[PDB]
Every structure is written in C-alpha cells, then in structure tokens.
Amino acid sequence: MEQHQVWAYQTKTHSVTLNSVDIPALAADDILVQNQAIGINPVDWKFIKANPINWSNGHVPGVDGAGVIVKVGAKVDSKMLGRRVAYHTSLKRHGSFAEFTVLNTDRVMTLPDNLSFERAAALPCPLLTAWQAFEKIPLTKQREVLIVGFGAVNNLLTQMLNNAGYVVDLVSASLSQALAAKRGVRHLYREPSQVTQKYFAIFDAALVPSLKANGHIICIQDRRTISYHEIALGALHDFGDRQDWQILMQQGEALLTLIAQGKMEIAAPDIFRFEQMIEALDHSEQTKLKTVLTLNE
C-alpha cells in the first residue's frame, strides 16, 4: 500500500538496483497504473549506459509497460479505473521499471481484453514508432521502398507498408526467407552492398544515391529536395498537445486490436521475472531479442 518496488538508476555504475520507495500521490490529470508487464527497449539500456539526459541517481527508467489503472487524480474520469492499458512514457519522469507508474490520463491505450499484458508491454515503443514512420510517406505511383535492418520496429513497419500497397525490399544478414516473405518482403538483401536500384523511400547522406529524386529518408534512431524525416516517439511528450495524443492513442488502440485478432504478427517476447531485471537488461542488449518482464510469475 504505502511503498513499492522500483529499479533505480545508479549514475556511478550505469546500472539499476532494487529499492522500495513511497508510492506518490497523483496530480489532477494523472493515473496510477499497477504494472503487470514491463517492456525493455533499446532506448532504456542505451540511456542507462550513456545517461544522455542527466538522470539523477534514483531515477526509475523504462519507457514501456502494461497493466491496470488502480487510482486516478481528481480531474480524471472515474471510468478509467480498472482499465487494462499499455503506455509509452516520458524518459524525463519515473518510468515502467517499477510495480507502479504515474501517467497522464490522455497518454495510455486501452488493451483488447484478449491481449496479454506480456504481449502488450512488447508493443508501445516499436508499434507507435513504426506507425509514425509509416505515416510520413506519401502514396504515389512510385511504391518501392527499402528497409534497412530487422528488429521490432521494422517488423511492424514492413507489415504496415505491405498492407498499404508498397513494394518493400529489406536488408538483413540473417532474417529467414520464410519470415521475410510472410511479412511481405519482395527482395531480401543480405548486405547493403547488394542494393543496386533506387527507391522512393528508405527507412533506416550516404543513402542519397539509392533514392529517386524527391524521395524520402526516414531515420528511426534512439539518438534538400530529398525529404528527411526523424521519428522520435518520446518527443510527443514534450511537443504533443491533447489532440495529438488522443489521435495517436486511438490509432495505437486500433493497431493493438489488429494484433489481438492475429492480423499483424509479432514474435513472442522473451519473458523474465521482475526480480531478474539485471539479467533481462543484459539479455535484451546482448541478444537484441525483444524482452519483457512479468510480474505474474
């Protein structure tokens, strides 16, 4: 009731340690989520390593989670209580590596009843990142696009593009032909040097020779008649107004529904217990396999 367990950042050793700290009272537009599963994203282990935004010792990392709304602030609609939600929270505030997380009420997505917490927690950062990147690209008569790398964002983005009518080629040293084809890939290149044609858009100045004039470069990173687009999902926390959030969350909900219905596929995350955060963080970073923590073990 009064305290909860958190994984708190240690600046000296670029690591997290388990502690019990007071559960905060909520602001008027805030909600308290009881986490049931916690996503690990590259940005989390990258920021743990580099501390690029000068987190204080004690800061709780973690952008992604999923769980149940158990308390709400004074101005929050009482209908939110008890909802199953997933979220992508700000890197500047205490995050998902905790039993409970404080979120803004406009910035969570309701889960389909048949979508597990563990699957949901594997989605907010890569699914919303993929959707933002997808939405940058016009649909013209030139439909050939190149995706560089395969990972959780590009898995989802490939499917979005193929579903919309784009012809998608992909660069990946070890993606199986069978999985590529399932996801809708036309040509699978095993290294960048094999790419010889030109594309309408590349999702990744070095790329310019591979672009049609007036094409698009979409940079998806945690870090002029060609249009350059930079996707930074977490920046909506700083720049998004309430309508921007409503629109995105509603689209995220729609996409979660497609996933729960089996219409868009993801590989099952590797699941660790909350207690084994350190081993999970190591696994995520070393294996690059999507990793999630569960509290239901």
XYZ file of C-alpha atoms in Angstrom:
297
model
C 0.000 0.000 0.000
C 2.455 2.659 1.109
C 5.731 1.653 -0.688
C 6.524 -0.131 -3.950
C 9.446 -1.806 -5.556
C 11.466 0.144 -8.200
C 14.643 -0.361 -10.190
C 16.534 2.864 -9.544
C 19.365 4.241 -11.648
C 22.910 4.430 -10.246
C 24.863 7.097 -12.144
C 28.298 5.887 -10.935
C 27.949 2.328 -12.215
C 25.412 2.851 -15.077
C 23.149 0.227 -13.587
C 19.897 -0.238 -11.721
C 19.289 -1.544 -8.238
C 16.138 -2.705 -6.485
C 14.634 -0.500 -3.806
C 11.346 0.213 -2.018
C 10.114 3.795 -2.228
C 6.962 5.671 -1.444
C 4.159 5.403 -3.934
C 3.397 9.017 -4.895
C 0.003 10.707 -4.539
C -1.312 11.778 -8.039
C -1.771 15.166 -9.836
C -5.245 16.107 -11.107
C -4.839 14.733 -14.678
C -2.669 11.740 -13.550
C -3.393 7.977 -13.221
C -1.553 5.222 -11.336
C -1.001 2.023 -13.254
C -0.223 -1.230 -11.495
C 2.302 -2.736 -13.898
C 1.772 -6.327 -14.952
C 4.421 -6.443 -17.631
C 7.296 -4.134 -18.443
C 8.921 -3.675 -21.825
C 12.617 -3.313 -22.327
C 13.547 -1.167 -25.335
C 16.960 -0.302 -26.733
C 16.489 3.307 -25.598
C 16.321 2.043 -21.977
C 19.642 0.219 -21.943
C 21.184 2.978 -24.138
C 20.179 5.711 -21.688
C 21.282 3.538 -18.723
C 24.697 3.327 -20.403
C 25.143 6.933 -21.586
C 22.810 8.926 -19.270
C 22.297 11.462 -22.043
C 19.624 13.495 -20.285
C 21.348 13.667 -16.901
C 19.084 11.463 -14.876
C 19.567 11.831 -11.139
C 20.611 8.867 -9.020
C 17.361 7.198 -8.073
C 15.639 7.817 -11.393
C 13.364 4.916 -12.409
C 13.916 4.055 -16.114
C 11.585 2.285 -18.577
C 9.523 3.749 -21.395
C 7.015 0.885 -21.944
C 4.629 -1.050 -19.769
C 1.245 -2.532 -19.452
C -1.094 -3.072 -16.542
C -4.218 -1.944 -14.740
C -5.350 1.525 -13.696
C -5.776 1.364 -9.900
C -6.064 5.054 -8.889
C -6.870 8.335 -10.675
C -6.320 12.019 -9.997
C -9.023 14.463 -9.080
C -9.927 15.607 -12.623
C -9.666 12.166 -14.238
C -12.798 10.397 -15.379
C -13.740 7.585 -12.909
C -14.406 5.347 -15.974
C -10.601 4.893 -16.266
C -10.448 2.889 -13.018
C -9.811 -0.817 -13.635
C -8.947 -0.449 -17.323
C -6.233 -2.651 -18.816
C -3.773 -0.312 -20.579
C -0.385 -0.098 -22.302
C 1.749 3.000 -22.386
C 4.844 4.746 -23.627
C 6.001 7.184 -21.007
C 8.493 10.055 -20.918
C 12.215 9.456 -20.372
C 12.264 12.527 -18.128
C 9.961 11.150 -15.444
C 9.940 7.913 -13.414
C 9.017 5.115 -15.768
C 7.948 1.490 -16.108
C 10.739 -0.298 -14.180
C 8.538 -0.415 -11.054
C 5.498 -2.006 -9.572
C 3.544 1.190 -10.243
C 3.876 4.033 -12.755
C 2.249 7.514 -12.765
C 0.967 8.515 -16.194
C -1.051 11.292 -17.797
C -4.632 10.139 -18.497
C -4.530 11.166 -22.202
C -1.403 9.077 -22.882
C -2.350 5.439 -22.465
C -4.000 2.891 -24.753
C -6.812 0.559 -23.700
C -5.983 -3.103 -24.345
C -8.174 -5.581 -26.062
C -9.500 -7.974 -23.405
C -7.690 -10.920 -25.117
C -4.318 -9.267 -25.440
C -1.983 -10.338 -22.641
C -0.038 -7.875 -20.580
C 3.175 -9.554 -21.720
C 2.380 -9.081 -25.397
C 1.096 -5.619 -24.831
C 4.177 -4.480 -22.986
C 6.300 -5.525 -26.002
C 4.499 -3.042 -28.234
C 4.174 0.651 -27.369
C 7.593 1.976 -28.432
C 8.084 -0.180 -31.533
C 4.427 -0.121 -32.658
C 3.932 3.632 -32.288
C 7.404 4.269 -33.753
C 6.520 2.078 -36.784
C 3.153 3.869 -37.167
C 4.744 7.344 -37.004
C 7.321 6.319 -39.600
C 4.674 4.776 -41.849
C 2.618 7.910 -41.737
C 5.431 10.108 -43.038
C 5.442 8.555 -46.541
C 3.125 9.639 -49.379
C 1.472 7.046 -51.601
C 2.448 7.890 -55.206
C 2.902 5.780 -58.322
C 6.489 5.060 -57.152
C 5.826 2.350 -54.482
C 9.279 0.736 -53.973
C 10.731 1.230 -50.515
C 13.799 -0.110 -48.709
C 14.007 -1.002 -45.052
C 17.451 -1.341 -43.505
C 17.642 -3.820 -40.631
C 15.165 -6.087 -38.967
C 14.108 -5.558 -35.402
C 10.877 -4.936 -33.526
C 10.069 -1.538 -35.230
C 10.876 -2.784 -38.744
C 8.921 -5.995 -38.262
C 5.762 -3.931 -37.726
C 6.636 -1.239 -40.303
C 7.167 -3.871 -43.017
C 3.643 -5.160 -42.451
C 2.126 -1.648 -42.436
C 3.843 -0.789 -45.722
C 2.951 -4.016 -47.445
C -0.682 -3.724 -46.289
C -0.849 -0.165 -47.763
C 0.434 -1.247 -51.198
C 4.118 -0.511 -51.015
C 6.676 -2.885 -52.510
C 9.156 -3.486 -49.698
C 12.725 -4.690 -50.013
C 14.722 -5.355 -46.822
C 18.421 -5.537 -45.824
C 19.170 -8.159 -43.198
C 22.093 -10.550 -42.853
C 20.088 -13.391 -41.223
C 16.288 -12.897 -41.479
C 14.921 -16.139 -42.874
C 13.477 -16.105 -46.388
C 10.333 -17.666 -44.987
C 9.749 -14.993 -42.283
C 10.645 -12.163 -44.728
C 8.134 -13.485 -47.230
C 5.475 -13.893 -44.505
C 5.943 -10.248 -43.547
C 5.605 -9.136 -47.120
C 9.200 -8.563 -48.282
C 9.890 -8.602 -52.017
C 13.725 -8.664 -52.272
C 15.816 -9.675 -49.236
C 19.354 -8.331 -49.386
C 21.946 -9.743 -47.026
C 24.144 -6.721 -47.111
C 23.889 -3.024 -48.100
C 26.386 -3.501 -50.908
C 23.918 -5.725 -52.790
C 21.485 -2.801 -53.145
C 21.740 -1.506 -56.700
C 18.336 0.003 -57.566
C 16.798 3.309 -56.477
C 13.885 3.662 -54.075
C 11.080 6.115 -53.317
C 11.831 5.912 -49.558
C 14.492 4.381 -47.359
C 13.748 3.681 -43.671
C 16.992 3.261 -41.679
C 23.595 11.459 -46.962
C 25.096 8.037 -47.725
C 21.602 6.867 -48.771
C 21.001 9.568 -51.390
C 22.482 7.623 -54.295
C 19.844 4.963 -53.670
C 16.913 7.463 -53.766
C 14.678 8.614 -56.557
C 14.778 12.408 -56.970
C 12.471 13.985 -54.435
C 12.346 10.751 -52.418
C 12.327 10.301 -48.610
C 14.782 9.239 -45.907
C 13.173 8.197 -42.630
C 15.567 7.948 -39.708
C 14.416 5.772 -36.864
C 17.019 6.116 -34.109
C 17.269 6.354 -30.346
C 19.979 9.011 -30.755
C 17.213 19.250 -49.639
C 14.624 18.195 -52.278
C 15.047 14.808 -50.568
C 12.669 14.901 -47.637
C 14.306 13.917 -44.372
C 12.078 12.656 -41.581
C 13.140 11.975 -37.998
C 10.965 9.749 -35.868
C 11.183 10.366 -32.110
C 8.186 8.927 -30.433
C 9.220 10.240 -26.986
C 9.270 13.840 -28.289
C 5.448 13.838 -28.367
C 5.648 14.061 -24.573
C 7.301 17.460 -24.981
C 5.508 18.694 -28.124
C 2.176 16.910 -28.396
C -0.963 18.702 -27.418
C -4.008 16.860 -26.077
C -5.430 16.275 -29.563
C -2.102 14.962 -30.853
C -2.167 12.389 -28.008
C -5.814 11.445 -28.476
C -5.242 10.770 -32.164
C -2.159 8.646 -31.562
C -3.648 6.637 -28.700
C -6.781 5.908 -30.716
C -4.600 4.669 -33.614
C -2.490 2.629 -31.214
C -5.706 1.028 -29.802
C -6.757 0.162 -33.332
C -3.421 -1.401 -34.004
C -3.474 -3.398 -30.728
C -6.900 -4.737 -31.860
C -5.371 -5.927 -35.164
C -2.597 -7.656 -33.267
C -5.042 -9.296 -30.783
C -7.097 -10.514 -33.767
C -3.975 -12.086 -35.376
C -3.928 -9.700 -38.308
C -0.479 -8.292 -37.665
C 2.179 -10.552 -36.269
C 4.984 -10.228 -33.738
C 7.491 -12.792 -32.350
C 6.662 -13.651 -28.721
C 8.831 -11.629 -26.330
C 11.372 -13.375 -24.066
C 9.887 -13.103 -20.599
C 11.846 -12.595 -17.358
C 10.596 -12.154 -13.827
C 10.587 -8.598 -12.432
C 13.147 -9.737 -9.861
C 15.571 -10.646 -12.640
C 15.730 -7.210 -14.188
C 19.531 -7.196 -14.353
C 19.636 -10.492 -16.293
C 16.780 -9.224 -18.503
C 18.576 -5.943 -19.321
C 21.703 -7.950 -20.205
C 19.671 -10.319 -22.374
C 17.948 -7.523 -24.252
C 21.078 -5.690 -25.042
C 23.252 -8.711 -25.910
C 20.728 -10.807 -27.804
C 18.772 -7.917 -29.342
C 15.689 -10.094 -28.846
C 12.613 -8.285 -27.589
C 12.484 -8.730 -23.865
C 9.753 -8.089 -21.326
C 9.394 -8.519 -17.561
C 6.327 -10.061 -15.988
C 5.000 -9.565 -12.553
C 2.683 -12.603 -12.867
C 5.239 -15.267 -12.022
